[PDB]
Every structure is written in structure tokens, then in C-alpha cells.
Amino acid sequence: GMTETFAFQAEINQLMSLIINTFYSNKEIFLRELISNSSDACDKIRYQSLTNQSVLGDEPHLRIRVIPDRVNKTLTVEDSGIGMTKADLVNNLGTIARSGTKSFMEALEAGGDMSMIGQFGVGFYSAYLVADRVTVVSKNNEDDAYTWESSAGGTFTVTSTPDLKRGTRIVLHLKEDQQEYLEERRLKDLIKKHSEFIGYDIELMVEN
Ligand SMILES: CC1(C)CC(=O)c2c(C(F)(F)F)nn(-c3ccc(C(N)=O)c(N[C@H]4CC[C@@H](O)CC4)c3)c2C1
């Protein structure tokens, strides 16, 4: 079969190459980063709802969920936030990814560290510290649900995927050495340590 691939621009490639090919001890920061993006996405739709309450539609509860899958060996971070359009995905948020990436790479070279990734709005890329493949399912009110996928290596795909009423689901396929992010105690301790700074409830899926 045939697949259609988009190419990451130079900046994103440089950042991903750094994240993937360099040893970093504090990989655990990825969770906080993904939860930060979710909280910001909830804020955007919440800001829109202030003038027009119908933007929330059938999904009023603005929530962040952390869901491990021990069978498929994946970690999901989902939200009922603003969501992303085909355009946001195809373009990789365009200028915001390139600007954040140039400034972050600059910060790193000048004394900044990987833990500061989120301060540059590029925190999503920290997923690549623990994941070998990242799948981003998203749905915005103005568009249909689409799936962004990248195993890095300069390319990504954006496929039409119905259907998540509004928001984003980020599925991380964890690396063999990163299976600790499937353990309940690990995720609990990490989510608790960060929930104190997130203005939305963070749901962790627990093992029955
Ligand atoms: C498009 C991506 C697949 C690839 C990308 O590059 C990238 C970046 C960037 F690096 F650009 F900043 N950030 N980023 C990302 C990742 C999680 C979310 C969330 N869970 O909502 C998100 N929300 C944007 C929705 C649009 C905005 O108006 C407001 C918040 C963005 C992604 C996901």
C-alpha cells in the first residue's frame, strides 16, 4: 500500500535528534509537559466559552486523563480541550513549533536545560524522551477528527480518522527501557506532584 508523508522542517528535526540521541536522566518530565499542553488547550476552549457557551456543546467537563495500556504498552494523555484542525496537524502548528524550537535550542546552548522545554511551548516533543512513536488524535469544533503520527526520522503523517467529541488524545508507544511509565505508583506520584499546579482535574486510569 501507499502512505502520504509530510516532512518536518529543519528546526523540529534538530530538536528531535537532540531529544532522541542524547542521554537525559530526568526523562519523567514528559508527563508534566503533555499535561501542561492539555491544560492550555482546556484554557483556550474555556476562554471561547466565556462569550459563546455553545463552543462546549455536548462536552462541558474540561478534564485531563492519563491512561496506561499494559497490553499494547502505551501511555495515553487525553483532554477535552480546544482540539486541533487538519491544518494545525499538517503544519505542526507552523510558526509556533519553529519559534519555540529555535529559542529552546538557543536556551540549551546558553545554559538552559531540557526540563525548561515547556517554557518555549515545544514541550510536546519531550514525548520522544520515552516514546519511539507518538500518535496524536485530535478533534476541533471547526473540523473533523484527524490523526497525526510520527516515529521521528524527519517525517509525520496526517490521516482522516472519525471519531472523542472535542479535544486531543496523545498515544505514546513507550520505548523498551521506559515501561516504568505503565506502573500505577509511578504515574500516581508524578501526577500528584504536578496536579497542584493544574486548574483541571487529572484522572488516572487505575487497574481493576
Ligand atoms: C501539532 C502537533 C502534532 C505537533 C507539534 O509540533 C505540536 C506543538 C508545538 F511543538 F508546535 F508547539 N504543540 N503541540 C501540541 C500538543 C498537544 C496539545 C494538546 N493536548 O492540546 C496542543 N494543543 C494546542 C492546539 C492548538 C493551539 O491553538 C492551542 C494548544 C498542541 C503539538 C502537536
Author numbering: 0 to 162, 165 to 209
Tell me, in the authors' exact words, what the paper reports.
Its main function is to serve as a molecular chaperone helping nascent polypeptides avoid mis-folding and limiting protein aggregation during thermal stress. T. brucei Hsp83 (TbHsp83), the subject of interest herein, is 59% identical in sequence to human Hsp90α.
Two of the crystals, thienopyrimidine (compound 3) and benzamide (compound 4) complexes, belonged to the orthorhombic system, containing two or three non-crystallographic symmetry (NCS) related complexes per asymmetric unit (ASU) respectively. The benzamide derived compound 4 was identified through a chemogenomics approach coupled to lead optimization to produce a highly selective and orally active Hsp90 inhibitor for cancer treatment. As seen in the compound 3 complex, the benzamide ring occupies the purine pocket in the same way as the natural nucleotide and establishes similar polar contacts as the other two T. brucei Hsp83 inhibitors. The modified dihydroindazolone group occupies the pocket 2 but unlike the previous compounds a hydrogen bond was observed with Tyr124. In addition to the polar interaction, the presence of an electronegative trifluoromethyl group creates a smaller phosphate binding pocket resulting in a tight packing between the compound and the protein, when compared with that seen in the TbHsp83-compound 1 NTD complex. The largest structural rearrangement observed in this complex was the flipping in of Asn91 side chain that created a disruption at beginning of the helix-4. The new position of Asn91 side chain was stabilized by a polar interaction with the indole nitrogen of Trp147. This interaction is an important step to narrowing pocket 2. The tilted position of helix-4 moving towards the binding pocket also affected the secondary structure at helix-4 C-terminus changing from compact turns observed in the other two complexes to extended β-bridges.
